[PDB]
From TrEMBL, chain B:
PROSITE patterns: N6_MTASE
Domain Methyltransferase small intervals: 37-170
UniProt KW Methyltransferase keyword: yes
One Pfam family matching this protein: MTS
Origin: domain of life: Bacteria
Entry's Gene Ontology molecular function annotations: N-methyltransferase activity; nucleic acid binding; S-adenosylmethionine-dependent methyltransferase activity
Classification lineage: Bacteria, Bacillati, Mycoplasmatota, Mollicutes, Mycoplasmataceae
UniProt protein name: Methyltransferase
Ligand binding (S-adenosyl-L-homocysteine): 28, 70, 72, 98-99, 116, 143
Keywords tagged on the record: Methyltransferase, Transferase
PANTHER family to which the protein is assigned, alphabetical: TRNA1(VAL) (ADENINE(37)-N6)-METHYLTRANSFERASE
Organism of origin: Mycoplasma capricolum subsp. capricolum
GO biological process per UniProt: methylation
Amino acid sequence: LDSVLVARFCNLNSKKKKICDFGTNNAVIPLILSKYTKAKIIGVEIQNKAVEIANENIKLNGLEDQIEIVHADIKEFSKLHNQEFDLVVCNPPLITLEDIIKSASRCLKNKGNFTIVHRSERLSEIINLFYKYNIYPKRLRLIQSKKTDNAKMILLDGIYQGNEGMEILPTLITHNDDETYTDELLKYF
Amino acid sequence: MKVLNDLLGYKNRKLYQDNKMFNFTLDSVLVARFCNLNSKKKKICDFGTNNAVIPLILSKYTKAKIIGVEIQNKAVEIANENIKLNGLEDQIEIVHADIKEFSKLHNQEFDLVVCNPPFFKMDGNPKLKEISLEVANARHEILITLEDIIKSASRCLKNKGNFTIVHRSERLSEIINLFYKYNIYPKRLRLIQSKKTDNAKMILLDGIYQGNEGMEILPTLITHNDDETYTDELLKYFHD
Ligand SMILES: Nc1ncnc2c1ncn2[C@@H]1O[C@H](CSCC[C@H](N)C(=O)O)[C@@H](O)[C@H]1O
């Protein structure tokens, strides 16, 4: 469910010509993104098991000329790809949160976009690491279970070598108090 | 010109407010109620207190000594009238001072600093859109800057002291980042939206001087139902 939220949150304008997914598993995010962009997508997965399915899913869906898997560690991969991507998106799980954000800055084009989903307790630390690697936080969205609940999940978008100022989108409430998904959540999926 | 009015539905609370100065807002009320007022907070400080609406509300919940710092002398006079009028002279004191220089002179004195800062930076003629220099000096960063407020809050606070702020949501990371720069660890956060479909316009943020990491993101506050009426959650803050 995280992966559907982070996918639809990605700001997919026409400047996106090359996108990357950190720790792509079955390539669910690339496949979802596929339905909104013509940019070439690259998914990076450290485990061969997941590589077969993701490749299988790109085969089954006939996007082999748009999406591609790469069997690598995000850290080593990113040192090899300076100023490459318009978007890096990562749905985190030997790789720390600082590693993900550093790696993202090592391989984004200037004014490119880094999109992450994570636990709400970690918002201030992610914001400090964004700034430590010259990523300027831009869009935030909170995820709450019910209207009376503390947020569990945050969605965070930032621009590498961008300017200052945030946009905080209307909080998302996943389900009503009957434990039925809210109409708002249904727009996703 | 001063007018006397009740401080929303807070019982035994009235306050004068001048039409050519800043009049309190929902922001003032919510940042007062968002403060943590546990028994350890023994001394409190309001940065830029104006007519002292924030102390007047905090006092309904704690017996701590409350100091209000304010720079515009016409407001200190109104503030001191409101404290006497409500008989709070024993608890609340007003000091005509600059936040910066006050903080340099009263270092490590407080367990809690709260602040409803001027929201807008300086960019052109600030008075062009205001009715009076005294309003412009409350809404724009002409006599104080955001970094000054946070730096000053760190000079005034004591270990495990608590800085509480309300501000525009566009500047949340800037604020987060200035917190870390002065060793204030963000802890509690709540977004305020007008409507369930609107972008958050305001944030409430709290953090601990020389504390630890870890954030609690409280449920978003919607202030209006789609029918344009105050929500029931908001009306809970209109009284004690
Ligand atoms: N440098 C400074 N030192 C002390 N107060 C200052 C200041 N610069 C601005 N202020 C004051 O800060 C206030 C900001 S408006 C906040 C009003 C009030 N605390 C409320 O919640 O409604 C103004 O009254 C302004 O005079």
